[PDB]
């Protein structure tokens, strides 16, 4: 076969160790998931700079006044979180983040709320978004893309074992830490799903066909999105690429992907099996689960345990000028945070 006797036995033992790890991880997750609040307040922090913006608020670099430690504070305007799924998703995000623990997931430190806003205070990751670095350099070489992809594979193996779907993979949500490893942020679309779920949500370029077609769907949408991410990292642009969302959706559902001439055949083979419309054939969704991905030829040089233990030398280390340095983030319009004298949407956010 492809493996000799010694290589096959080592792989088998490796997969039994994964099972052992995930069983312990599920025990630790459930303890925090069953008993999640109000671990700080706004005036405990100095607000420094906006690091990113969305339709519901912003993420700001903040400095804890007492300790001087820096954090990233996500501020959500409760009155902007108006639509039904916008509300449920915000509760998903907080509850999941307080319960998970993995080396490539951003760590939540505090959460609280006031009359106007919801707040989630996270570890500050000063290396910036993968997105910026990718757009600046153009594309990543296949070994460089593979290093990041392996971290996402392990992170999804972890999340999916807890019945969590992530649902918003893209370079904008992948921060680079001081050692060059990934930290996944923005769990606004993450959800605990034991089988199928039905919300039409995500980012157009990264949506699996079954989402676009209003089909009930499962964790395999994350493996489709991994295919999009790997393609974009290695090409510099995603596989379904058009100016308007409706045009993007048409390309996704077609079942057609073209590859740059510089893609290795191993990479193209992996991507055709991730970007697979037929769910009975999509890698990650078959009887051998995530091992069809981890054992694919394109990952043959990947030491999965060494990636997890962060023993592998990273292809890129961001420059850091010191604590609180924001040089690796883009600039955004600043808007003062106003807290109303009246409580807004108190009942819609009781559990936060």
């Amino acid at each position: 076969g492809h493996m000799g006797n010694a290589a096959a036995a080592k792989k088998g033992s490796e997969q039994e160790s994964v099972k052992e790890f995930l069983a312990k991880a599920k025990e630790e997750f459930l303890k925090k998931w069953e008993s999640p609040q109000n671990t700080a307040q706004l005036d405990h922090f100095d607000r420094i700079k906006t690091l990113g913006t969305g339709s519901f608020g912003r993420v700001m670099l903040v400095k804890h006044k007492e300790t001087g430690n820096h954090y990233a504070m996500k501020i959500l305007d409760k009155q902007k979180v108006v639509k039904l799924k916008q509300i449920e998703h915000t509760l998903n995000e907080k509850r999941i983040l307080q319960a998970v623990n993995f080396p490539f997931l951003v760590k939540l430190e505090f959460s609280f709320k006031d009359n106007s806003n919801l707040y989630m205070v996270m570890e500050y990751v000063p290396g910036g978004e993968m997105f910026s670095h990718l757009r600046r350099i153009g594309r990543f070489s296949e070994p460089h893309a593979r290093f990041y992809a392996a971290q996402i594979v392990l992170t999804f193996e972890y999340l999916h074992s807890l019945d969590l779907i992530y649902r918003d993979l893209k370079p904008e949500n992948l921060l680079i830490d001081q050692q060059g490893y990934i930290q996944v942020t923005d769990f606004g679309f993450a959800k605990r799903v034991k089988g199928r779920t039905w919300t039409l949500c995500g980012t157009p370029e990264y949506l699996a066909p079954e989402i676009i077609l209003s089909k009930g769907y499962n964790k395999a949408v994350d493996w489709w999105a991994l295919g999009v991410l790997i393609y974009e990292m290695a090409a510099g642009y995603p596989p379904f690429f058009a100016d308007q969302p409706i045009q993007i959706y048409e390309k996704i559902v077609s079942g057609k992907v073209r590859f740059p001439s510089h893609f290795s055949s191993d990479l193209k083979d992996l991507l055709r099996n991730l970007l697979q419309v037929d769910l009975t054939k999509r890698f990650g969704n078959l009887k051998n689960g995530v091992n069809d991905i981890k054992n694919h030829k394109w990952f043959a040089t990947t030491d999965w345990i060494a990636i997890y233990q962060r023993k592998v030398e990273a292809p890129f280390i961001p420059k850091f000028k010191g604590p609180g340095d924001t040089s690796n983030f883009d600039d955004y319009e600043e808007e003062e945070i106003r807290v109303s004298i009246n409580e807004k949407c108190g009942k819609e956010f009781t559990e936060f």
């Binding site: 918003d168 039409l200 370029e205 642009y237 690429f241 058009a242 100016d243």
Partner: peptide, 14 residues
């Protein structure tokens, strides 16, 4: 090869 090159917003519904 015309497509979106800036940051892409996620959509919660529709």
């Amino acid at each position: 090869a015309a497509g979106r090159t800036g940051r892409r917003q996620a959509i919660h519904d529709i």
